[PDB]
């Protein structure tokens, strides 16, 4: 899965900017990456305490929002080729739980995606 490189990089970056992100987001996000409509990987981006954590599998506790999308579509979003809000309304990106929180995370990570 191409998305693995991205989750691993978010993990590496949190080690340095994690505290600031945690204060700003204060949520837990679970990700179900599909490949064949079938789940190929699950990830959790915990931005609830400490410097945050990125780990494989389902959230250890409750996830505030769960995002489900294909590996390919996730990469399109990351590369700026697919707008996540447009993907959500077209049905390519599913979001469960507190949907608007993921948009909060989107904007906060964008900031750090240029420092």
């Amino acid at each position: 899965l191409q998305s693995t490189f991205v989750f691993e990089e978010i993990g590496r970056r949190l080690k340095d900017i994690g505290p600031e992100v945690v204060k700003k987001v204060n949520a837990v996000f679970e990700w179900h990456i599909t490949k064949g409509g079938n789940i190929g990987a699950k990830w959790t981006i915990d931005l609830k305490s400490g410097s945050g954590k990125v780990y494989q599998g389902p959230a250890k506790g409750a996830a505030d929002t769960t995002i489900i999308l294909s590996d390919e579509d996730f990469m399109e979003v990351v590369l700026g080729k697919l707008d996540p809000q447009k993907a959500f309304f077209s049905g390519r990106l599913k979001a469960r739980g507190n949907i608007m929180l993921s948009q909060k995370l989107q904007m906060i990570l964008k900031d750090y995606a240029k420092l």
Side-chain angles (χ1 to χ4, degrees), residues 55-72:
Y55 55 83
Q56 303 188 306
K60 290 163 184 156
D64 292 276
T65 316
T66 300
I67 302 84
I68 305 98
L69 78 178
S70 70
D71 185 55
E72 167 65 47

Side-chain angles (χ1 to χ4, degrees), residues 1-21:
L1 305 167
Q2 287 178 25
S3 55
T4 297
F5 295 108
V6 181
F7 281 105
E8 289 181 344
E9 175 61 22
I10 291 172
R12 313 181 211 296
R13 301 196 177 208
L14 290 180
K15 300 281 69 177
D16 315 325
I17 73 172
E20 305 96 285
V21 179

Side-chain angles (χ1 to χ4, degrees), residues 61-93:
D64 292 276
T65 316
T66 300
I67 302 84
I68 305 98
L69 78 178
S70 70
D71 185 55
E72 167 65 47
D73 281 352
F74 175 94
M75 296 311 295
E76 283 182 26
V77 166
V78 164
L79 300 175
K81 298 164 67 178
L82 180 64
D83 181 290
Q85 280 63 61
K86 295 186 181 183
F88 174 78
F89 293 109
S90 69
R92 290 169 72 173
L93 185 161

Side-chain angles (χ1 to χ4, degrees), residues 20 31 35 42-43 46 56 67-68 94 104 106:
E20 305 96 285
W31 301 77
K35 193 171 184 183
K42 287 189 181 180
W43 294 87
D46 180 319
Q56 303 188 306
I67 302 84
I68 305 98
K94 297 178 185 181
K104 178 184 173 185
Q106 178 189 336

Side-chain angles (χ1 to χ4, degrees), residues 44-62:
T44 296
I45 295 180
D46 180 319
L47 297 173
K48 196 64 176 183
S49 203
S51 48
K53 184 179 177 189
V54 169
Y55 55 83
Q56 303 188 306
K60 290 163 184 156

